[PDB]
Structure formats: C-alpha cells, structure tokens
Design an enzyme around this catalytic site. Structure first.
Site, mmCIF file in Angstrom:
data_model
loop_
_atom_site.group_PDB
_atom_site.id
_atom_site.type_symbol
_atom_site.label_atom_id
_atom_site.label_comp_id
_atom_site.label_asym_id
_atom_site.label_seq_id
_atom_site.Cartn_x
_atom_site.Cartn_y
_atom_site.Cartn_z
ATOM 1 N N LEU A 18 -4.308 24.788 40.304
ATOM 2 C CA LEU A 18 -5.735 25.008 40.585
ATOM 3 C C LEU A 18 -6.437 25.917 39.560
ATOM 4 O O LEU A 18 -7.655 25.836 39.388
ATOM 5 C CB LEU A 18 -5.911 25.590 42.004
ATOM 6 C CG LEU A 18 -5.675 24.661 43.209
ATOM 7 C CD1 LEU A 18 -5.596 25.457 44.512
ATOM 8 C CD2 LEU A 18 -6.750 23.584 43.293
ATOM 9 N N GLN A 20 -5.618 28.856 35.930
ATOM 10 C CA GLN A 20 -4.742 29.295 34.854
ATOM 11 C C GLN A 20 -5.274 30.597 34.272
ATOM 12 O O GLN A 20 -6.364 31.039 34.629
ATOM 13 C CB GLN A 20 -4.691 28.214 33.772
ATOM 14 C CG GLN A 20 -3.407 27.413 33.749
ATOM 15 C CD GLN A 20 -2.352 28.079 32.883
ATOM 16 O OE1 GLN A 20 -1.958 27.541 31.849
ATOM 17 N NE2 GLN A 20 -1.912 29.270 33.283
ATOM 18 N N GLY A 21 -4.494 31.210 33.386
ATOM 19 C CA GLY A 21 -4.930 32.430 32.705
ATOM 20 C C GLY A 21 -3.830 33.270 32.075
ATOM 21 O O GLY A 21 -2.686 32.822 31.941
ATOM 22 N N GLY A 24 -1.364 34.651 34.969
ATOM 23 C CA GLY A 24 -0.415 33.685 35.530
ATOM 24 C C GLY A 24 -1.140 32.440 35.991
ATOM 25 O O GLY A 24 -2.109 32.024 35.353
ATOM 26 N N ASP A 131 -14.836 44.753 41.324
ATOM 27 C CA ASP A 131 -15.293 43.549 40.608
ATOM 28 C C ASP A 131 -15.798 42.519 41.605
ATOM 29 O O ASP A 131 -15.320 41.389 41.646
ATOM 30 C CB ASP A 131 -14.179 42.946 39.719
ATOM 31 C CG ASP A 131 -14.700 41.831 38.769
ATOM 32 O OD1 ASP A 131 -15.872 41.895 38.308
ATOM 33 O OD2 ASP A 131 -13.927 40.879 38.481
#
Ligand SMILES: CC(C)n1nc(-c2ccc3cc(OCc4cccc(Cl)c4)ccc3c2)c2c(N)ncnc21
Length: 261
Positions: A18, A20-21, A24, A131
C-alpha cells in the site's frame, strides 16, 4: 523478555503493498488467518530497539476510537507493527481522488469533528502529535477518520515550533487550523504559490490564508483562532470538537450547499 503485544511471525500474511519509503513498507494483510489488518514493516538497517521501544509505549498506552489502534508487534528485527486497517487510505489521497468531487461541507466538517475528538483525547492525556495533517489521517468505511503516525513540513507547523522547537498541544491546534484548509479545498497544498522560506517570513509578519472559495467565513474565523501568534490564545480541542459537532445548528444553520462546498 517480551510483553502481551507480541505475536508469532506465522500469524501474519502480507497480501497487497500500500505504501513505500525510507522507513519501510505498509501492507494490507491478515492476522491469525481471520482478521484484516495493516502491517508496517521496518527495514533492518533503520532505527534500533533503543528508539523503537521508547516510541512503542506511546502507541501501546493511548487508546481511542479516533486514533488508529495498535493490534500487535513483532519486536525482534526484522520488525513488524500490526494495526487496524483503514479501507480508504490517507485523508489526503481521499480528498484528491474520486471522492473529492462529491464531498460537501457537512461531510468535511464531520471529518474535522472526528479528528478534533481524537486530538482532544491526546490533549487529555497530555501528549503531543507534532505532525498533524491530512497525510497522517486515515479514513475508513462511512467516513470514519482516525489520527495516525505520531512524530520538512513547515507549512503545517506553528512558528514557535518551527523556530524554537516549542512543540505543544497548542502547536497541534495550529496544524489543525491548516488541516481545515486541506479539508475545505479538497486537499490542496496550503499557501499555494509560496515556497517554504516565503511562508515563515510571511506568517511571522502576520499573514494568514484567506477564506477558501465557498467556505463560510465563520469557519475561516475558527481557522484564524487556531493561527493566533500567542500559543495560549488558541482554542483547545475540547472547544474545537464541540464547535464542529454543533456547527450546523449553533453557527451556520442556514447553510445552503454550493457547487463544491
Ligand atoms: C495509507 C496506507 C499506506 N496506510 N498506512 C497505514 C499506516 C500508517 C501509519 C502507521 C504507523 C505505525 O506506527 C509506526 C511505529 C513506528 C515505531 C514503533 C511503533 Cl510501535 C509504531 C504502524 C502502522 C501504520 C499503518 C495504514 C493503515 N493502518 N490502514 C490502512 N492503510 C494504511
């Protein structure tokens, strides 16, 4: 020594990617072969149990129907965190996408009310998100919104936090104010046309976003209350929740739908 949140690794099935980055990945999956779940994997290279376990307690202690719930963890690396599944993804993708066309102010104020309810719980518990913004809100069936992912985005951050690191519940109120413009513009970046440096210089010398098209001025006042220079004059989430819950009876009772809001 491991606590009650631990689960064996066999109990998780990762089925669809679903997100990404650098942190993880995030997957939709199944827990104990029978429970729809979101799974967040962490790459073994990134942050260790020193800063994982300190940041885990937060998501283990806090519990509220408007914060995304932890279900389980695999703590030894490679790490897996299992939370409730939110079928509609992030609020930001939701507003930008196919659904944005059809959402009107009643629904949009309702989502705001819900987030305000989650953040009012954070306020009671004396925590700080740091945030808060549409990208970190998830949506589920029946427009349920839930606060997610507790802590560069200076456009969402209150000046005292961005300049001096004074992050407080009152700096989250400021970010809520910005969130309201994301809701009322169907997910547009705030301060359109303005680079980050431009935003600090301007906000610091009094500039505030005007009223978005078709959004009632009473709602833009609420925004301006959240954006007060002095942190202590900004309203609480208790207040904000109540204001938004009661909005169409107490504040804007002759509201008539328009083309977009
Ligand atoms: C938008 C999509 C990729 N997504 N992301 C998530 C999602 C977003 C943020 C998350 C943050 C999480 O916490 C991070 C973390 C980090 C260190 C230690 C702990 Cl205990 C927890 C865990 C799962 C998450 C899962 C999600 C969900 N729960 N349901 C449906 N879709 C989801």
């Amino acid at each position: 020594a491991k606590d009650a949140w631990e689960i064996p690794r066999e109990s998780l099935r990762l089925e669809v990617k679903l997100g990404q980055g650098c942190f993880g990945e995030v997957w939709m999956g199944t827990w104990n072969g029978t429970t729809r779940v979101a799974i967040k994997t962490l790459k073994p290279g990134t942050m260790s149990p020193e800063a994982f376990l300190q940041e885990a307690q937060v998501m283990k202690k806090l519990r509220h129907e408007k914060l995304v719930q932890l279900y389980a963890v695999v703590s030894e690396e490679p790490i897996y965190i299992v939370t409730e599944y939110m079928s509609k993804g992030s609020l930001l993708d939701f507003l930008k996408g196919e659904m944005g066309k059809y959402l009107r102010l009643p629904q949009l104020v309702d989502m705001a009310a819900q987030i305000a309810s989650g953040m009012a719980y954070v306020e009671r518990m004396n925590y700080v998100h740091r945030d808060l913004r549409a990208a970190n809100i998830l949506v589920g069936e029946n427009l349920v919104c839930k606060v997610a992912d507790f802590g560069f985005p200076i456009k969402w951050t209150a000046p005292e936090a961005a300049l001096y690191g004074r992050f407080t519940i009152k700096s989250d109120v400021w970010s809520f104010g910005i969130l309201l413009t994301e809701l009322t513009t169907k997910g547009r970046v705030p301060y359109p046309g303005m680079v980050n440096r431009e935003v600090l210089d301007q906000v610091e010398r009094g500039y505030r976003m005007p009223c978005p098209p078709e959004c009632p001025e009473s709602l833009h006042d609420l925004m301006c209350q959240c954006w007060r220079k002095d942190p202590e004059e900004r309203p609480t989430f208790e207040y904000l929740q109540a204001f938004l819950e009661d909005y169409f009876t107490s504040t804007e009772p002759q509201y008539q739908p328009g083309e977009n809001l």
